[PDB]
Amino acid sequence: TLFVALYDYEARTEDDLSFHKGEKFQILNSSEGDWWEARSLTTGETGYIPSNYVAPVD
Ligand code: NA
């Protein structure tokens, strides 16, 4: 399942990932917690994203 960003997000450190509303991601790990390691389908960049900022694609 692919996820889409609901809002813009600016990373605070090297470990999280900045993104724009509407950006899509593949999810790598989702069972450490509510922050998921993800890969942008736009840039190929990877990093942690807050799961409350994304929703599963239609
Ligand atoms: Na979500």
Which method resolved this structure? Answer: X-ray
Are the C-beta atoms of 3 and 17 separated by less than 8 Å? no
**C-alpha distance across the termini of the chain, in Å:** 10
Compute the distance from residue 57 Cα to the ligand 1 centre, in Å. Answer: 10
What is the span of the domain harbouring residue 57?
Answer: 1-58
Compute the distance from residue 14 Cα to the ligand 1 centre, in Å. Answer: 22
Compute the distance from residue 20 Cα to the ligand 1 centre, in Å. Answer: 15
- Helices and strands (H, E) in the chain, number of each type: 0, 5
Resolution in A: 1.5
Task: Mention every residue, 6+ apart, whose C-beta is less than 8 A from residue 9.
Answer: 16, 17, 18, 19, 49, 50, 53
Using CB atoms within 10 Å of the CB of residue 1, give its burial: 0 to 12 exposed, 13 to 18 middle, 19+ buried. Answer: exposed
Tokens of 54: 């994304």
The structural domain count of the chain equals 1
